[PDB]
Design a protein around this ligand. Sequence first.
Ligand SMILES: Nc1ncnc2c1nc(NCc1ccc3ccccc3n1)n2[C@@H]1O[C@H](CO)[C@@H](O)[C@H]1O
Length: 381
Amino acid sequence: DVGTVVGIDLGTTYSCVGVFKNGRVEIIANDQGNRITPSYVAFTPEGERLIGDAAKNQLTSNPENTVFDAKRLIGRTWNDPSVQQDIKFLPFKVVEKKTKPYIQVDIGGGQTKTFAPEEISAMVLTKMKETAEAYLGKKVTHAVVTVPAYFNDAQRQATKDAGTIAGLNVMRIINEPTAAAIAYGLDKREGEKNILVFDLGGGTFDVSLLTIDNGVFEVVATNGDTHLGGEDFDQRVMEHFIKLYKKKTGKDVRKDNRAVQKLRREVEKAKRALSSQHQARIEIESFYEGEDFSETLTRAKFEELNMDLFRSTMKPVQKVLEDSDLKKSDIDEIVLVGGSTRIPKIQQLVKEFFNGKEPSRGINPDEAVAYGAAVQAGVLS
Ligand SMILES: Nc1ncnc2c1nc(NCc1ccc3ccccc3n1)n2[C@@H]1O[C@H](CO)[C@@H](O)[C@H]1O
């Protein structure tokens, strides 16, 4: 009845779909060649609804009508303090409607529409759903969707409604740090064990303490920083180079923002190379006023610029071990999740915190959560 069911990580900044096929989890690439999709939606002036890479790629020219970060609003009331903080930093319009924070956008030709956070995520889920169905050759109807461990009843439910709207029956909602633990099969051992998931993504940092008892996962304590992640590290290097531009050219870069978004691009690119290389080069043709940008970043400078931010990632790890009444000696597994955990300093930091103990390694940290979900989805047909 339920067909092939899909594992979906519906993430804040990125999304991932997986499937179980011929005895293996298959992570599916979208129509753009990508194993992760931006949780992005956009409406061009022509009236063309773009979701994914296509929406993320044109957000510079369409900042009002490019919806992102809906996970911050999903399952929340308009008057929720968190929401009233969040909407201050969000360049599309959020209105109070049916007690909720509805996204307001121009659909094309100045024509106005509002969308509940669940309707946006339903668009993102539809893209994951068409991403899966293109790989499989068939329609998909059922799914396993993940949420962060802190999500409450209303947030969990609204994620299921995003699902329903997308034409997806969400059979299971599983916690994100749990799906990760399942991806490493940590649920396939006898014992009582403690698991620390340290999840550092694009715009969020989450640390979960889990206990596993014979396939029974329990979340004991959670911590983190809802506004700390890879984008933050981008900003810091962006600041470094804007400040360097000034000092050499005398020119100031935030006068054209299209220059700023260009730098954003080549910074994020350089950072990523720097998890693998010791130096990277940032090259921009017609950066500002037609002039060409060309600079490099050492890994040492990268680390230097974010050292206080990297280091701050330990404090949640301590508050978690406190609230779980456990010392450092008690953690039996360390699971790294999120693309930012590829940063070498981050790893050095985790490892020496826990007195030299090596983390679980082997699964792509961007994919670990959709993987966990796809494993469970695999059981469900
Ligand atoms: N190796 C890496 N090193 C440091 N940060 C990395 C990283 N890979 C990703 N992410 C995976 C990623 C993201 C975009 C990509 C684009 C082209 C090619 C590969 C890509 N890979 N991130 C950060 O994860 C956050 C959430 O993704 C973002 O802040 C991102 O910087």
